[PDB]
Design a protein that fits this description.
Shape: globular
Largest sheet: 7 strands, parallel
CATH superfamily: Peptidase S8/S53 domain
Domain Peptidase S8: 7-279
Binding site for Ca(2+) 1: 175, 177, 200
Bound molecules: praseodymium ion
CATH topology: Rossmann fold
Number of domains: 1
Number of helices: 6
Disulfide bonds: 34-123, 178-249
Radius of gyration: 16 Å
Distance between the termini: 8 Å
Structural class: alpha/beta
Cofactor: Ca(2+)
Number of strands: 15
Helix content: 10-25%
Catalytic activity: Hydrolysis of keratin, and of other proteins with subtilisin-like specificity. Hydrolyzes peptide amides
Strand content: 15-25%
CATH architecture: 3-Layer(aba) Sandwich
Strand order of the largest sheet: 4-5-3-6-8-10-11
């Protein structure tokens, strides 16, 4: 399948080179997989989700995304126009408030929730969780991410926007998950992207167009935007049967574009998420 004039991030993930505009992908499009977006919520009513999104848990007064951040990330996972895996099922878990903030206790509860809740869903091709969030180092937050991964969920987490070593941020610094840095459309490390040995992979993160609340769209930047590219890619590859929740991050690194990125510090992987679609 081919989407013409795609957001640059989608085009990038289906090309060995920067600068292309068409997103090439297998028509299976992540069908049969499930992605939990653990964030500010998802505006499930957005036409771009086509009925494939639903809120399943909130830790606040409402399940509504009153911010937009979660809706943007969910859109990059699986919206029609802005999504990597355009036919996946999206599940919203609101651990962040409408200012985009959340307590670590709540974020941990949300991860534990997904580990259990997946056992009540039909997700024959597997389960992914996208965590576009984080703050300073916490062994408890890292452990929650490790548990979620161990439970059989492909966990993708943001590296953080501190232009620093991700070792000092959580859940980024949890080794057993998939820690995602951000790149821009000229294949530079995004100016804000964290780096370091714990990064597993980079995804498009600068000037990423996706869904927003109020049935709208906008372009924003962050390792928060790179993370759902990788979560969506994992879902897509799992639907194709090429990999599993336990092995998808490694598979994505195995098959990534290598050495294409600039301003990568020595000791940080130079690996950019790539779907290797061959029609
Ligand atoms: Pr290349
Ligand atoms: Pr890792």
């Amino acid at each position: 399948a081919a989407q013409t004039n795609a957001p640059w991030g989608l085009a990038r993930i289906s090309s060995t080179s920067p600068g292309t505009s068409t997103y090439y992908y297998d028509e299976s499009a992540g069908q049969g997989s499930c992605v939990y977006v653990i964030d500010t919520g998802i505006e499930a009513s957005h036409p771009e989700f086509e009925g494939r999104a639903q809120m399943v848990k909130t830790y606040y007064y409402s399940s509504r995304d009153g911010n937009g951040h979660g809706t943007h990330c969910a859109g990059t996972v699986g919206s029609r126009t802005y999504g990597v895996a355009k036919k996946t099922q999206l599940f919203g878990v609101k651990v962040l408030d409408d200012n985009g903030s959340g307590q670590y206790s709540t974020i941990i509860a949300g991860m534990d929730f997904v580990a259990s809740d997946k056992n009540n869903r039909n997700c024959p091709k597997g389960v992914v969780a996208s965590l576009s969030l984080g703050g300073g180092y916490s062994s408890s937050v890292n452990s929650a991410a490790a548990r979620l991964q161990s439970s059989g969920v492909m966990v993708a987490v943001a590296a953080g926007n501190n232009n620093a070593d991700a070792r000092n941020y959580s859940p980024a610094s949890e080794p057993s998950v998939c820690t995602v840095g951000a790149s821009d459309r000229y294949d530079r490390r995004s100016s804000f992207s964290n780096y370091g040995s714990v990064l597993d992979i980079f995804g498009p993160g600068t000037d990423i167009l996706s869904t927003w609340i109020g049935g709208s769209t906008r372009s924003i930047s962050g390792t928060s935007m790179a993370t759902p590219h990788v979560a969506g890619l994992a879902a897509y590859l799992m639907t194709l049967g090429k990999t599993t929740a336990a092995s998808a991050c490694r598979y994505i690194a195995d098959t990534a574009n290598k050495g294409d990125l600039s301003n990568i510090p020595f000791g940080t992987v130079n690996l950019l998420a790539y779907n290797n679609y061959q029609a």
